[PDB]
Amino acid sequence: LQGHIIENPQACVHHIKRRDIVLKWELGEGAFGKVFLAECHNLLPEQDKMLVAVKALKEESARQDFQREAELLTMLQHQHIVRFFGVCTEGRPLLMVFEYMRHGDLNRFLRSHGPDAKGEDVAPGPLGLGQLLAVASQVAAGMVYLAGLHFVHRDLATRNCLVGQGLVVKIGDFGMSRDIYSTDYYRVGGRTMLPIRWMPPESILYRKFTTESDVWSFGVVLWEIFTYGKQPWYQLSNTEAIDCITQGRELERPRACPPEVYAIMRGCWQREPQQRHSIKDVHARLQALAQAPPVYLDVL
Numbered sequence: 001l002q003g004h005i006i007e008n009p010q011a012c013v014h015h016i017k018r019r020d021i022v023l024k025w026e027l028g029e030g031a032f033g034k035v036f037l038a039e040c041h042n043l044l045p046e047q048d049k050m051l052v053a054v055k056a057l058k059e060e061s062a063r064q065d066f067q068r069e070a071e072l073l074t075m076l077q078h079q080h081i082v083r084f085f086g087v088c089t090e091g092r093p094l095l096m097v098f099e100y101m102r103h104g105d106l107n108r109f110l111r112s113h114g115p116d117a118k119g120e121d122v123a124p125g126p127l128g129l130g131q132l133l134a135v136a137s138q139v140a141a142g143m144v145y146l147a148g149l150h151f152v153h154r155d156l157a158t159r160n161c162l163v164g165q166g167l168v169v170k171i172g173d174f175g176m177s178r179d180i181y182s183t184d185y186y187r188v189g190g191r192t193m194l195p196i197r198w199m200p201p202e203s204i205l206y207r208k209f210t211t212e213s214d215v216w217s218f219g220v221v222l223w224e225i226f227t228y229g230k231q232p233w234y235q236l237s238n239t240e241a242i243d244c245i246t247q248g249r250e251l252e253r254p255r256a257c258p259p260e261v262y263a264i265m266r267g268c269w270q271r272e273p274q275q276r277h278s279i280k281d282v283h284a285r286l287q288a289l290a291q292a293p294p295v296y297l298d299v300l
């Protein structure tokens, strides 16, 4: 499905004993399975006992797909990709073990730290310019890594990023986005749900997905960040958003967004995929601004 790692045409899979996993409570549930918070014993040398997110898959094709999923997730090792620890194949259900990200999905985190909201890692009130850039740079670093391994995401959006302790941001999700954020998808035939608001015209019109369609989605992610998690084209219905995107309309500059950052967004939104800036360049630009001294960021 769109955004699933198995859509990539790209064993060393680590196994965990069922006894080493102790389920605490459910974190969520979707069409593909349930996600629990659990304690995992003897996983990391110093740890002894550590918190993890455990995806219990619903279930053949399912067992075959599971193995291909774990192989692909095992290939990923980067500071800005949600860590995959391994599987549990003893008994049912089959389990996938991941690191636990304390602050939840990036969309929820932006909204809870934005002007429309009701203090350990973040100051009171809306996130500052420097925090917004740090968040953007980290998502970009994750996208640089995936592009380097020739992976295509297809569902890049803040809902599909997680936030951990110390404001660490990583790309990853436990396959519940269509269930938690159903309004972020356009349902085509009772089953297929498309994240049209994050998609470029070649993906909507021609159903083509590449590193360049992901860079367009990154531009939309940049916009979500600088709007504090607001839905792109929120004022438009699903058909009206398809019309705007195909007609070549671009999202307005967010109020918290400096001109320099908006130029980075527009670079991701070139009609011709070939003309879009590389993620490597997008990352270098955002990282530079993120680590800029307060004197420089204050005038931006």
Ligand SMILES: O=C(Cn1c(-c2cccs2)cc2ccccc21)NCc1ccccn1
Binding pocket: 001, 002, 003, 004, 005, 006, 008, 032, 081, 082, 083, 084, 146, 151, 152, 153, 154, 171, 172, 173, 174, 175, 176
């Ligand atoms: O596989 C993913 C997302 N995903 C990840 C990760 C998921 C966790 C940690 S990293 C890496 C990756 C690399 C290329 C493309 C997608 C990728 N999500 C699960 C899903 C999506 C849709 C429907 C059902 N299940």
